[PDB]
Design a protein around this ligand. Structure first.
Ligand SMILES: CC(O)(c1ccccc1)c1ccccc1
Length: 261
């Protein structure tokens, strides 16, 4: 619980997530892993807050990195990606609060079992609740974890995958997910729920550390389990970044299963 590429090996025999509906002991709450054979849609948001007193470097670039990663290896078509960044010239693609909320609704609308939805955010993060900050937050305010959960998690049918990756700080509970995993094992779980398949990656204590690690690991060694992905992301980050990656989920994860999108 090292190979020729100097990375942590997944289990010798790694299974795809099971297609059968899963259950949680002691309760009547089913869930289903997505097979990720359906529609692939992504919402990618990168905000530098250009011109502001707390302008950031690298977040727009993080978004472009994820866009390129998803379109050039993972079957996300440009027509099925909404990318919101604050340095480009189309108002409908600026990460204003209203555009972000609309895009979040668009992402999950009519999602079907075995679809694979992806969410990426790089920008300001904070803890009031964890929150994220649209470019117009000074006037419109942030978007809080409870609302992101209500928009993007609550409506999902059994077996819809949502994979979320946050490059922002203090974003560990940003989707209000009840399970959290580190490289060392389970660090949070309910004291016994969605039936969907929601998983998220975020960092806990320039450029996005999580997208940096995720893209490099998946580019060099695309075969990973949930746990080996975490371990290899952690290895890549050690020394350079102050961040350690954690995986949160709407359901218990068999961490030895293959990570697919
Ligand atoms: C991205 C853009 O600079 C912007 C607009 C609004 C807030 C922050 C940044 C823009 C886009 C279209 C038209 C005007 C300005």
């Amino acid at each position: 619980y090292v190979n020729a590429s100097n990375m942590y090996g997944p289990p010798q025999n790694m299974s795809l997530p099971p297609p059968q509906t899963q259950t949680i002991q002691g309760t009547d709450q089913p869930y289903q892993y997505s097979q990720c054979t359906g529609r692939r849609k992504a919402l990618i948001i990168g905000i530098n807050y250009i011109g502001s007193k707390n302008q950031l470097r690298g977040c727009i670039n993080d978004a472009h990195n994820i866009f390129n990663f998803l379109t050039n290896g993972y079957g996300y078509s440009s027509d099925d990606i909404v990318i919101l960044t604050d340095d480009q010239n189309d108002l409908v693609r600026v990460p204003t609060r209203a555009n972000m909320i609309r895009a979040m609704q668009w992402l999950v609308k009519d999602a079907q079992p075995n679809d694979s939805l992806f969410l990426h955010y790089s920008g300001h993060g904070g803890q009031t609740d964890d929150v994220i900050y649209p470019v117009d937050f000074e006037t419109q305010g942030p978007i809080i974890d409870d609302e992101m959960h209500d928009i993007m998690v609550k409506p999902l049918q059994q077996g819809v995958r949502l994979t979320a990756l946050f490059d922002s700080a203090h974003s560990g509970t940003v989707l209000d997910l009840p399970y959290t995993y580190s490289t060392k094992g389970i660090i949070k779980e309910p004291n016994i729920f969605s039936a969907a398949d929601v998983v998220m990656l975020s960092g806990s204590k320039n450029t996005g550390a999580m997208s940096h690690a995720f893209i490099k690991v998946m580019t060099l060694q695309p075969q990973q389990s949930y746990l080996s992905l975490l371990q290899n992301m952690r290895k890549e980050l050690a020394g350079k970044y102050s961040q350690k990656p954690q995986l949160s989920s709407s359901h218990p994860i068999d961490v030895n299963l293959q990570f697919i999108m």
